[PDB]
Structure formats: structure tokens, C-alpha cells
Amino acid sequence: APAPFADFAPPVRPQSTLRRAITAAYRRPETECLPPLVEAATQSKEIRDAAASTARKLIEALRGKHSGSGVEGLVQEYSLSSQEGVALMCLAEALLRIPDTATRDALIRDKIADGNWKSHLRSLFVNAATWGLVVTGKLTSTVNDRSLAAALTRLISRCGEPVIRRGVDMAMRMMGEQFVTGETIREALKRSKELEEKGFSYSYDMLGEAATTAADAERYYRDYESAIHAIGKASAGRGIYEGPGISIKLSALHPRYSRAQAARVMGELLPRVKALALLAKNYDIGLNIDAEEADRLELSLDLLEVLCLDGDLSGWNGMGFVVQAYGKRCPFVLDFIIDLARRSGRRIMVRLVKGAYWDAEIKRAQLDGLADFPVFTRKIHTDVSYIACAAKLLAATDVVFPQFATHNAQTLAAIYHMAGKDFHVGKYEFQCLHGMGEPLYEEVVGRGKLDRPCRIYAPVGTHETLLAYLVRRLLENGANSSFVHRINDPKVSIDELIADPVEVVRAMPVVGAKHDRIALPAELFGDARTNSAGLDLSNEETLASLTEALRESAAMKWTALPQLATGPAAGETRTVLNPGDHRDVVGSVTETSEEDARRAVRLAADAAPDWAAVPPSERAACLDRAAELMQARMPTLLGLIIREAGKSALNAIAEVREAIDFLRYYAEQTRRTLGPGHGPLGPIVCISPWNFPLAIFTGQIAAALVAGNPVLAKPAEETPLIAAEGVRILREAGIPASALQLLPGDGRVGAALVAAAETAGVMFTGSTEVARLIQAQLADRLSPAGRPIPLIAETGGQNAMIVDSSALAEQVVGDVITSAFDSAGQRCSALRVLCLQEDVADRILTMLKGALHELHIGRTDRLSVDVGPVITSEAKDNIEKHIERMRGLGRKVEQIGLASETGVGTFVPPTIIELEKLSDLQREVFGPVLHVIRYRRDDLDRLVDDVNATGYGLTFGLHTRLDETIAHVTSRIKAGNLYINRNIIGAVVGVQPFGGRGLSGTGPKAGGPLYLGRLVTTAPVPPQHSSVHTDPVLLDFAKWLDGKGARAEAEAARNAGSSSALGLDLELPGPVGERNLYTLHARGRILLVPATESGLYHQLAAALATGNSVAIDAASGLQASLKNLPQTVGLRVSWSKDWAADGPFAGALVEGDAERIRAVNKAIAALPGPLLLVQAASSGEIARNPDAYCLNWLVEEVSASINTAAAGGNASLMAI
Ligand SMILES: Cc1cc2c(cc1C)N([C@H]1CCCS1)c1c([nH]c(=O)[nH]c1=O)N2C[C@H](O)[C@H](O)[C@H](O)COP(=O)(O)OP(=O)(O)OC[C@H]1O[C@@H](n2cnc3c(N)ncnc32)[C@H](O)[C@@H]1O
Ligand SMILES: NC(=O)C1=CN([C@@H]2O[C@H](COP(=O)(O)OP(=O)(O)OC[C@H]3O[C@@H](n4cnc5c(N)ncnc54)[C@H](O)[C@@H]3O)[C@@H](O)[C@H]2O)C=CC1
């Protein structure tokens, strides 16, 4: 049995002083990074004046020679709107997918120009976001395909064949000659002769990036290898400076290129790069390693170090390496590289760039709650950093070859003059991008200009391949701060363009201040609350500190005892074992006797007045203190969750963050709402699951406590230790022992607590079956006021993702792998059914299976583990029986092989099962088991039906670029948490309030604004909770009431119409690159059980005002009270003799005395399907209290999270 965490995340090599200086700068405050950069970048007045004159001369040349884009001339010539321009280019792209040039011409002449283009040519507009950038300079995340179809029809009917021909020729020039140097390396090489004769050189990029499978990594490898041969053959001995080179991306060459997989990267990726470098060495060409995301920077240094020290590569100086000046570590990376160049004796080619991932780095740091960004946040800071880093490189030209890649004429001029008067080919060079930098560098290369060489970075690939880096380049070029946008911008003067960024930064009030409009991750929510803080598992200092803290957590004698108001209780004690290795004992639990569970409820009842008397803000302060304690203790809490719950470090971090967020969110929501009139329910029984043994545990308990209720906390029998630690933290933060009692044990303890007479409310997260058993036990009971005992139950889902042929396969696969198998599929939100449009199903399925086999399954105390065990042997048996049944029915089953070491724990291999029909799946399988179905596009609406038909409604994912498909699917799906173009897991508190409908639970949403209101007897008005919309059937009903003489009910109906929040439509603060929406809809059909005519009218007003239809109990005998309804109201009303036949319902309204309410409540609990949120009132309550039926519980909350960076960039952030 290996010692826990003994091999958690050992670094590839001991970190040298130079390496440690890199890591120390990773997220250094921006005000601290800039002053040394300002100083390093300072040049003399004489130099600065000379540089401005040279920069001015270059810009005047740029602005002086022929502008006027081909696309712009085409739009002008045919008077095209923007949408027609985009639509036309999409049409041209599609026409060019036809290889036979004559076949394309006949299609244009005989079918396209004549009329219905739809009949012949996967949406035509899949890539319209890219063409929209080409046409308008603006990036839209998704495609209004109905607008584009209308515009394409309009333009063809107006201008016919001539405009189509002009569009085809225009796209042919852009895609074949402007976006790529060539479609193949041999073609790109041919076209490079022209500019090589003028003094340029070339570096070829085989547009290849992010392998998701081993097969794709091998394909990219053989692409690079064949390109190296063709470039080396063409180089023909010209050497690494005058001759052409290649650029590679390491992420192309291995599907798991990350720090977490460092051992595989060094064992499997490194030999591949060495083999390519050996080939580049034989031909004597440059081989440059491109720079990618910030969390790959230091890992790439380990590969660079081995390669530069590998004697088999000696005698060749062509190895090159990109460093990104927008990165805070850039100068320290250069120190390391320059030192490595001295040690190895290799003159490393150093390409200095600004950086291509800025948008994505902002979003990622915010999502992960890290201390700061790894890039600058003001564009001018990157320019200073670049110039400062150029000074460092120019002082080391004897040992490195600097390559200044930039299209910024001011940056160029500053370096040109910084480099001084002595030059020779091989001292340094400039670089630019094909089709972008040649205007500028035609003013640089050659004896008649500045006589400095420029290497052109030449993308290579087919039209399909090119439509990826096309968005990045066009977005980076068209950003409001980008030099190439500003030079084209006529309002921008040359004086603005040649302004020295070094002197502008120096003269600022606070040097290096963060961008005003970008929130640090900790400040995402502004004044409302402090974001929880995460941990960077790519940071070697973090990994080293965490290794120590995780080991120490495994030395602790964790215990959980029955913690009653009076003190710890005795009981039967047993060990708690690591589900990944039963030999690893995590702690001991003493479980609660049934007698002591009943005693705990009585003590909670006795204590309830004293806890209720603590002012709401002071109850909130306890939560905020507990959040602080959990944040401080996160490393230790991580280690407990890893070993007790079988979770990976990554997921444990997110769980602790989520518990912190719950505490701070409910504290803020309390300070926003609760006053004296919002009295507590009383003792609340909180029953929690094992799969989020701290987050969901803490969330339910914190909400009940801060709402003024004492809590009986019953954690899952599998995970009592982290629960005991959470209660200990909450008590330490100030929750009295009598207000929070811990009762470890199995479902018998849970049931004793639920049955106890003083139990005033139940919060349950777990299986639907147990929730249904709890509901049935509570149906027998009423509160002191004679009202039903509230149950909040969140019960999981049968969650689907629909993927159409417009989605990007690699994005889909990554989101599918994460959604289905993260946490061994033990999330209620996990992806269970992937639905693939038939025309892309085979390709996506192939990549999915390939990505499945790259997952590492094992005991979770190693960073390299992706998927841990399932929680118990019984779970493992249940899941495996489902798999084998599917296999026995002939379904295709893909499974990864498990290592022998998993035998000591309870593991299920991640599994893909291909189904014929969604109806093949008849139960939630709570494991790492993804089911895949395929669908024809015309059957999309039927498929949405099939998804809804399961009766569940928790999470739902949609991958598509097409607005019509988004509007269709999101308006027809019935689920609580929607996700567009992203994964469907890890809902964030206050951002994606979490909770569903149907078989997925009662609501209200955890981490949402209606949650606390369910835990008090009089619900407060939540923040932002209102709507200006009035249900029109409600209004028709109120007029009908006035017509029948029911004046008071008519007034009460209109009041409900105004009070309803139906139609609330909010955007919630969150990370950049994402839009997080929160809306209130009708729940569905409300079961009405009235007793009196007036009671029925009030019930009907309540249901209609919230958008619902109704089924009214025919046994009430009140049919004569609804004679002559307007058809609009009639459409919403049905009468039910057999309630179970007319379901499912989405809620219920009951009128009666205490005995009648109990009888109806019991009958309702026996209705099959969803647990119904039931509201009850006496006739007198209805007459006295306008809120007798609370409208909070008659609407349905919906969260939708849309990844607006999905098209390849952040448009809003590019205007920053
Ligand atoms: C010419 C060239 C360029 C690259 C490459 C080769 C060659 C020959 N390789 C390539 C290999 C694979 C990807 S391409 C390469 C790159 N990139 C990469 O990451 N890895 C790589 O390997 N690039 C892209 C550059 O990093 C950079 O984005 C682009 O060139 C714009 O810089 P400019 O011409 O100085 O414009 P300019 O002076 O306009 O600056 C634009 C840049 O400023 C930065 N910026 C914008 N807003 C900012 C803000 N609010 N705060 C801070 N900074 C901000 C950002 O980096 C942006 O790109
Ligand atoms: N919605 C979610 O996030 C969760 C869903 N589940 C579902 O439940 C299955 C897990 O099996 P279990 O873990 O046994 O879930 P379970 O729902 O039985 O356990 C849930 C909680 O209820 C308690 N409990 C069990 N029977 C009870 C009863 N009769 N009265 C009162 N409390 C009772 C348990 O002790 C635990 O604290 C999974 O396969 C999955 O389908 C389980 C965990 C989380």
C-alpha cells in the first residue's frame, strides 16, 4: 500500500534558481511587474526621437499604398448589406467544397442563380462567424442563420449569377492565397519563392493544434515530419537563418499535454519532438516550438531543456522557442533560456511575440478563482514588456538569435533603433504573419529600406483546417487596441500611433495599474460578496506546498461522532475507508442511535427560540466566518475529500470553493432580505449525499441556519468525516452547538430524524426514491400552523447534450469527456445521453472513443489521475450490471482497460454505450457511463420530446453555432440548468443557480435567490425578484370574475397578476466570456384542490398569474362556478376525477381545514412521478392573507449559461 500522497505531483526536475524565479512571477501583481520593465525599456531622447521618425515614415508608407479590401469592393459594387456579404461568402465557401470546377459552374448557372440555393448545398452558415469578421470586423459568437438565409435569398434574387461568381472568386483568393500561404506544404513552398527573392524568409505552420486522441496526435506528427522533409528539401543547404523553417505546437503532438500528465509528456511527447528535431537537424532548418496557454509555459521549458541538453541534437542551432511578452514571466523565462543557451552551447532561436490567448487567459483565471492573471490586462503593458524583453535579447545576440515578431510599426522602430547600427544576417531578425505583415515589412527588408530581414510565418492547410486560426488572427487584428486596426482607423492619427508606450506608462499616476474594467477573480461579484479562491495546479510552488499539506491531512486521526446539543454521544464505531483503496483507512465514525436522533430533534426544538433570536446579520456573520475558515483550511479539506470521497484534487478544490461560495452567498442573501417578520420554520433535517460530501452538506445546512432554524445534519453514511469537519468549522465560526447537531449514520438515522414530531422542514439531496419515501412520511404531518412540512429535494437527472453538425468536434469531445466522466460520473449534473446529428456522429464518436482511452483511472492521491473510484462496491455492482445488460442486448460498449492496482478499490472504467433510442435508457445510472444516440436533423424537435419524456429536468447541454437551433431547443427543452457550447457540470453559486424540475426535484434552486425563502414561514421578497409582465390569461380571468360579480376575487386576481414574477429575465454577474441568465417561467399544470368557490377563484388566479395551466379536482363539486369562461382561460383549465391519470403536475394548491389538508397531501404524495410542491391554506386564510398561496413557488427557475467565447474569441473583451 503506497503511502498517501507520496507521489502526488513530483516535478519533472528539481527547480533551479532560474526556474523558481519564473514560477514566482506567475501571477505577480501588475503594479509590481511594470517598474522593472519600464526601466529596461527606457532609451535615450535621441533614440526615442529617431524611433518616432522611423515609425512615422513606416505608417505614412502603410497608409499611402493601396488599401480597399477585395471584400469591401465586392460589397460596394453590388450594394450588399453586411449580412448579404457574409451570406455570399458562406455560399462561396460551400461552392468551393465542390472539387470539379465545371460541376460547380453548372450548379451556379443552372440551380443556384436560378432560385432555391437551399435545395442543393450541414448549414451553409456554419462558419459565418468567421466571414462576419472578414466582412464587418466584428465577432459574433453564434450565427443568425435565419437572417443569413434571408439575405442570401435576397441577394441572389436581386443580382443573380454575377454576384455569385464574384463571391466565389473572392473567397478562392482569400482561402487559398490570403489566409494560408498554401493548402499543402508543397504549394506553400512554391508560392514562397517570390518573397524569398526579395529578402524574406519563411516559417511554416501546419495548422494543427490540440490533439484529443492518440490517432490525431499521430496524424499531426506525420504532418510535421512530412513538412520537415519538404522544407528541408527546398531549403537545400541555405541554413537556419536564410532558409525556411518549421513551427510546431506541442499540444498537437500529444492528446494529454499538461502539467497534470507531466510523466506522460516527458515519456511520450518528448521522444516525438526529438525525432522531428533530429530531422530538422539533418536538413539544417529551424524548428520553432510555438507558445500556447499560460499553464503550458513552464512544462514546455522542461522539454526545451532536455532537447537542448540531448547530445544527439548537437551541432544544430535551429531549435527555436516562443516567449509571450504579454506574460508576467517573460523576462524570467528569457533569463532561463539565455542561460540554457550558454550551458548547452546552442544558439537558441527566441521568437518574441506579444501573445495570442489574451481573452482566454482572462476568462480562465476568473473561472479558477486564482490570485491574479498570468498576463497583463492593459495592452500598453504588453508593449512595454515586449520592448523591455527585446533589450534583454539584444544584449545576448552572441548566445541566442532574437526574432522580433510584430506588426506594430512603433514596436518595430523602437527595436530597430535599439539594435543600433551594426547588423549582419544571423544577428537577429523580425517576423510577421503571411498576408498581414508584408505591407509593413516591404518597408523594412532590403538595402533600399531598413535592410533588416523578416521571416514570414506561413500557415499551411486546407480550407476546412484554416477556419480556426482564422478567427484568432482576424479577431486579434480587429481588436480596438490592435495596431493593425488602429492604422486602418481614420480617426487615429500618426501621432497617436507613434506614441511611446514606455513614456505613457511611466507618466501614469499608478504605474502598472490593472485595467479598470477587468475584475480580479476575487472581485467577480463586486460589493455583493468575495469570490472563493482556488489553487493553481500548474504552479510548482502550489504543488509543493499542497503535497506537504495533503500528506499531513492523511496523518490525521479524522473522526465523526454524534454531536448533540449536550455533547458527543456514544454509539457503534467503524472505520471509514478510501474508496480507491480499502487498505487506506481514512478515519473512524461513531454512528447515531435511533434514540439519540430523536433526542437531537427535541433539543433542536428546545434551542430554536434562542437561535431564531440571533439577528439575521449575526447569523450571516457566522456563515462568513465559516467561509473564511474553509478558505484558510482548503489544503487540509482537499486531502480529506480526496481520500474519503475518492475525488481528484481538481474536483476537491472546486468542491471546497463551492462550500465557501454557499456560505458567503446565503450570508449576503440574508443581509439583503431577512427581517423580524420572516420567522423560522423550526428544526430542519438536512440529509446530504456522498458525492459532494462537503459542498451540498454545507449548502443545505448554512441556508437553514442563516434562515434562523436549528439544524440536524445527517451526512451520507459513506462520507461522515468531512461532514464532521464542516460542523466543527461552523461551530468554530459561532454556530451554537444546540443550533447545529451532527448525526452520522445510515438511512435509518435519516428516517428517525424525518419522522421526529418536532421536525419542521427537510432538505434532501440524493436519490428520487428516497426523496419519495421522505415525502410520503411527511405527507402524514402538519406544522403547528396546520401547514405541510416543507421538503426541498434535489434528486438528479437523465441529462442530455444535443450536438449538431455546426459544432466544433474537438470542443464537443472535451466537453463530453468532462461532463460524463469527471468525478466518475457521480455528479447529479453528469452527461448521461449524448445526441449526435447523424452526419457528424461517426467522426465525433471516433474522437470520443479515442479521448476515452487517454483517461487515467486510479487512486486519487496523484495529480495524474483523471477519474477516481466509485463510492462503494454496491455502486460498482449496480453500474456494472447496467453495462452488461446493455452489452447483452447487443449495444456497442467501449471501455478503457483498468490497471491491476484498481483491484484494491471500487472502480468502474469510463464507458461509452451506443443506443438505438433514448427509450433504451430507463433509469439514472450514477456512474461513468455515457450513452450515445444519433438523430436526423429534421427529427430535432422529436428528440427534444424524447429528452423531456424521461421525466427528469436537471442539466441540459446544446452545442451549435446556429441561432435558430438555439432558440428552438432552449424554448422546447424542460430543464433547470441549460448550457450552450460548454460542459454541463460544476454550476457556480449565484451564477448558475442549480436545481431542476420533474423527477429532478422540487426547487427552489440551491445557490439561488428563492432558496432562503422556503426555510421561513413568511417568504421575503428576494433581490431583483419582480416582473413588469402580466399573464394575459390571468387578465382575461380577472375580467371574467368582474363579469360574474366576483369583484373581490377579480381585484385579488389583478393583484396576483402584478405580484407574479413570471417573466423575470436577468443576467447574473460572472466571468468574462460567458453570459449567465436567470429567468422565471410557468411550472406547468398545477393541481388545484379547492373547497369553496372563492377558494377556487383565488387558487386559479394564483396559478394563471404565474403562467400555469390547472387541473381542478372534480370531487370539489365546483364545476358550476366556472360557467362560460373565455376560451383563453378555458384552454388552461381541465377537470380531473383521477389525478394520477391527468399528471404529471408541477405543483398543487389545496384548500381545507387541517384534516382535509392532510388527506389531500397524502393523496398527492401517492401520485406517480415528480414530487409536487404543495401549498395549503384554510378558507379563512385565503380570505385574510393575499399571500395565502405564495407565488414564489408557482414559477419555475431556469438558469442558462452560454459560452460566448465559443467561436474563438471574446468580442466584448476585445473592445477593452
Ligand atoms: C508575427 C507573429 C505573431 C505570432 C507568432 C509568430 C509570428 C511570426 N506565433 C504564432 C504561432 C501560433 C500562433 S501565431 C505566436 C503568437 N502568439 C502566441 O501566443 N504564441 C505563438 O507561438 N503570435 C501572435 C502574437 O503573439 C500577437 O498576438 C500578434 O502578432 C499581435 O501583436 P502585434 O503585431 O505586436 O500587435 P499589437 O502591437 O497590436 O499588439 C496586439 C497584442 O497586444 C496584446 N494585448 C491586447 N490587449 C491587451 C490587454 N488588454 N492587456 C495586455 N495585453 C493586451 C495581445 O497580446 C495582442 O495580441
Ligand atoms: N441528486 C444527487 O446529486 C444524488 C443522487 N444520488 C442517487 O442515489 C443513488 C445513491 O445511492 P444512495 O447513495 O443510497 O442515495 P440515497 O439517496 O439512499 O442517500 C441519500 C441520503 O439519504 C439518506 N437516506 C437513505 N434512505 C433514507 C430514508 N429511508 N429516510 C431518510 N434518509 C435516508 C442516506 O443516508 C443519505 O444521507 C445514486 O446511484 C444516484 O442515483 C445519490 C447521491 C447524490
DSSP string, 807-875: S-HHHHHHHHHHHHHGGGG-STT-EEEEEEEHHHHHHHHHHHHHHHTT--BS-SSSTT-SB---S-HHH
Looking from the CA of residue 797, the nearest atom of ligand 2 is 1
Q: What is the DSSP letter of 1026?
A: -
Q: Is 795 annotated as a binding residue?
A: yes
263 is in an annotated binding site: no
Phi first, then psi: give them for residue 957, nearest 5 degrees.
-120, 145
Distance CA 344, CA 1054 (A): 82
**Omega of the bond leading into 1144 within 30 degrees of 0 (cis):** yes
With beta carbons less than 8 A apart as the criterion, state whether 1167 and 1090 touch. Answer: no
Task: For residue 288, report the distance from its CA to the centre of ligand 2, in Å.
Answer: 54
Task: Provide CB contacts within 8 A for 1006, sequence distance 6+.
Answer: 662, 696, 699, 700, 703, 794, 989, 993, 994, 995
| CB of 712 closer than 6 angstroms to any ligand 2 atom | no
CB 414 within 8 A of CB 379: no
Q: Which of 911, 973, 977, 909 is nearest to 941 (CA)?
A: 973
Ligand with minimal distance to 826 CA: 2
Q: Which residue shows C-alpha cell 516562443?
A: 322
Other beta carbons less than 10 A from residue 303's beta carbon: 20
714 lines ligand 2 (CB under 6 A): yes
> What is the spatial distance between Cα 888 and Cα 885, in angstroms, rounded to a whole number?
5
Look at residue 736 and give its three-state secondary structure.
Answer: coil
- Residue 288, φ and ψ in degrees, nearest 5: -110, 130
The CA angle 1038-1041-1043, to the nearest 5 degrees, is: 115
Instruction: Report helix, strand or coil for 191.
Output: helix
- H or E segment at 784? none
Ligand 2 close to Cβ of residue 924 (< 6 A): yes
Is 328 one of the annotated binding-site residues?
no
Q: Is 377 annotated as a binding residue?
A: yes
> For residue 49, how far is the Cα from the chain centroid?
48
Q: Residue 685: what residue type? A: V
Whether 717 is in the pocket of ligand 2, judged by its Cβ within 6 Å, is yes
Please give the distance, rounded to the nearest whole angstrom, from the Cα atom of residue 472 to the centre of ligand 1: 10
Query: What angle do the packed helices 1032-1043 and 1093-1105 form, to 10 degrees?
Result: 160
Residue 770 near ligand 2, beta carbon < 6 Å: yes
Ligand-binding site membership of 84 (annotated): no
Any ligand 2 atom below 6 A from CB of 872: no
Name the β-bridge partners of 587: 558, 576
**Cβ atoms of residues 964 and 831 within 8 Å:** no
- Nearest to residue 715, comparing CAs of 753, 685, 688, 748? 688
Backbone angles phi, psi at 567, to 5 degrees: 135, 180
Counting from 1 in the atom list of ligand 1, the atom nearest the Cα of 456 is: 8
Ligand 1 atom, smallest distance to 482 CA: 39
Eight-state DSSP code of residue 345:
T
How far does the centroid of ligand 1 lie from the alpha carbon of residue 962, in Å?
29
Question: How far is 929 from 915, CA to CA, in rounded Å?
Answer: 12
Tell me phi and psi for residue 50, to 5 degrees.
-65, -35
Closest CA to 835 of 849, 822, 853, 816: 816
Annotated active-site residue in 668, 794, 810, 894? 794
Ligand 2 centre to CA of 765 (Å) is 7
Alpha-carbon distance 1194 to 1196, whole Å? 7
Residues with CB under 6 A from ligand 1: 247, 290-291, 322, 324, 326, 353-358, 375-379, 381-382, 405-408, 411, 431-433, 457, 476, 481-483, 515, 1216
Atom of ligand 1 at shortest range from CA of 484: 39
Q: How far apart are CA 995 and CA 985, in angstroms?
A: 12
Identity of residue 1030: T
Q: Ligand 1, residues 205, 386, 476, 498: which to mutate, most atoms within 8 A of Cβ?
A: 476
Strand ranges inside 339-473, DSSP E: 348-353, 400-405, 429-433, 454-460
- Compute the distance between CA of residue 1120 and CA of residue 1143 in angstroms, rounded to an integer: 23
Q: How far apart are CA 997 and CA 860, in angstroms?
A: 33
C-alpha 389 to ligand 1 mean position (Å) = 14
Instruction: Give the DSSP letter of residue 898.
Output: P
Q: How far is the CA of 926 from the centre of ligand 2 (A)?
A: 11
Residue ranges of the alpha helices (H) in 243-325?
262-264, 270-283, 297-309
Centre of ligand 1 from the C-alpha of residue 325, in Å? 8
Is residue 1131 packed enough to be buried (19+ CB in 10 Å), middle (13-18) or exposed (0-12)?
Answer: exposed
Q: State how far the Cα of 337 lies from the Cα of 419, in Å rounded to an integer.
A: 20
Active-site pick, 159, 308, 389, 828: 828
* Residues near 922 by beta carbon (within 8 Å), at least 6 away in sequence: none
Annotated resolution, angstroms: 1.9
The atom number, within ligand 1, closest to the CA of 355 reads: 26
Count CB atoms within 10 A of the CB of residue 1085: 20
Complete DSSP assignment for 910-948: -EEEE-S-GGG--S---SSEEEEEEE-GGGHHHHHHHHH
- Single-letter residue type at 458: A
Active site residue 794: yes
Nearest residue to 297 via CA among 597, 540, 619 = 540
Strands 929-935 and 911-914 turn out to be parallel
Atom 11 in ligand 1: which residue has the minimum CA distance?
A: 290
Q: How far away, in angstroms, is 989 Cα from ligand 2 center?
A: 22
What is the SS3 string spanning 64-133? HCCCCCHHHHHHHHCCCCHHHHHHHHHHHHHHHCCCCHHHHHHHHHHHHCCCCCCCCCCCCCCCHHHHHH
At 711, list the grid cell: 439544524
Structural element, H or E, at residue 310: none
What is the CA(766)–ligand 2 centre distance, in A? 4
For residues 1112 and 1129, what is the distance between their CA atoms, to the nearest angstrom? Answer: 13
Sheet strand arrangement including 911-914:
892-895, 911-914, 929-935, 831-837, 799-803, 955-959, 977-980, 1195-1203, 1074-1082, 1065-1067
Q: Is 355 annotated as a binding residue?
A: yes
| 3-class DSSP state of 564 | strand
Residue 768 CA to ligand 2 center (angstroms) comes to: 8
**Residue 699 near residue 1008, CB atoms below 8 Å:** no
Closest ligand relative to 497 C-alpha: 1
- Atom index in ligand 1 nearest the CA of residue 381 equals 52
Q: Which residue has the least CA distance to atom 54 on ligand 1?
A: 379
For the question of residue 828 being annotated catalytic, the response is yes
597 Cβ closer than 6 Å to some ligand 2 atom: no
Residue 1021 CB contacts under 8 Å (≥ 6 apart), including other chains: 673
Q: What DSSP state is assigned to residue 43?
A: -
Instruction: Tell me: is residue 438 an annotated ligand-binding position.
Output: no
Candidates 1193, 1185, 1183, 1190; CA nearest to 1095 is: 1183
Measured in whole angstroms, how far is the alpha carbon of residue 56 from the centre of its chain? 44
Closest to 134 measured CA to CA, from 197, 199, 179: 179
- HSE (side-chain half, CA atoms, 13 Å) at 965: 27
Provide the strand spans (E) within 434-493.
454-460
Give CA–CA dist 1013/1021, Å, rounded. Answer: 8
Contact 1170, 1003 (CB under 8 A): no
H, E, C per residue of 194-262: HHHCCCEEEEEEECCCCCCCHHHHHHHHHHHHHHHHHHHHHHCCCHHHHCCEEEECHHHCCCCCCHHHH
Q: How far is CA 8 from the centre of its chain?
A: 26
Phi, psi of 435 (to 5 degrees): 65, 10
Ligand that comes closest to the CA of residue 828: 2
CA separation, residue 153 to residues 110, 118, 877, 1016 (Å): 16, 9, 58, 58
C-alpha–C-alpha distance, residues 287 and 123, integer Å: 39
Residue pair 566/650 in contact by the 8 Å Cβ criterion: no
The ligand with the least distance to the CA atom of 516 is 1
Nearest ligand by distance to the CA of 878: 2
Which atom of ligand 1 has the smallest separation from the CA of 407? 34
Is 1167 labelled a binding residue?
Answer: yes
Identify the burial level of 642 via C-beta atoms within 10 angstroms of its C-beta, where 0-12 means exposed, 13-18 middle and 19 or more buried: buried
Counting ligand 1 atoms within 8 A of each CB, the residue from 246, 353, 383 with the most, and so the one to mutate, is 353
Cβ-count burial of 267 within 10 angstroms (0-12 exposed, 13-18 middle, 19+ buried)?
Answer: exposed
Q: Do the beta carbons of residue 654 and residue 637 sit within 8 Å?
A: no
The span from the CA of 256 to the CA of 214, in Å, is: 9
Cα 880 to middle of ligand 2, angstroms:
19
Picking from 679, 690, 661, 704, the residue whose alpha carbon sits closest to that of residue 791 is 704
Q: Which of 589, 770, 879 to mutate to test the pocket of ligand 2 (most atoms within 8 A of CB)?
A: 770
Tell me, using a 6 A CB cutoff, whether residue 718 lines ligand 2.
no
Q: Which three cell numbers stand for residue 472?
A: 484568432
Q: What angle do CA 46, 48, 49 make, to 5 degrees?
A: 65
- Strand-pairing partners, residue 1065, are 1079
Calpha distance 1070→991 (Å, rounded): 6
Q: How far apart are CA 840 and CA 934, in angstroms?
A: 9
Burial class (CB in 10 A: 0-12, 13-18, 19+), 728: middle
Residues 1107 and 1128: beta-carbon distance below 8 Å: no
H helix count then E strand count, the chain: 46, 33
Q: For residue 797, give the ligand nearest its CA.
A: 2
Query: Which of 354, 384, 434 is the pocket-test mutation for ligand 1 (most atoms within 8 Å of CB)?
Result: 354
Measuring CA to CA, which residue among 1146, 1186, 1 is closest to residue 580? 1
State yes or no: 717 annotated in a binding site. Answer: yes
Q: How far apart are CA 1097 and CA 1041, in angstroms?
A: 8
Q: For ligand 2, atom 20, which residue shows the shortest CA distance? A: 766
Cα separation of 619 and 1105, whole Å?
Answer: 35
Dihedral angle over CA of 548, 554, 555, 559, nearest 10: 140
Mutate to test the pocket of ligand 2, among 589, 767, 795, 1000 (most ligand atoms within 8 A of CB): 767
Residue whose Cα lies nearest atom 9 of ligand 2: it is 767
Please count the other Cβ atoms lying within 10 Å of the Cβ belonging to residue 478: 20
Span from the CA of 690 to the centroid of ligand 2 (angstroms): 8
Experimental method: X-ray
3-state DSSP assignment of residue 1016: strand
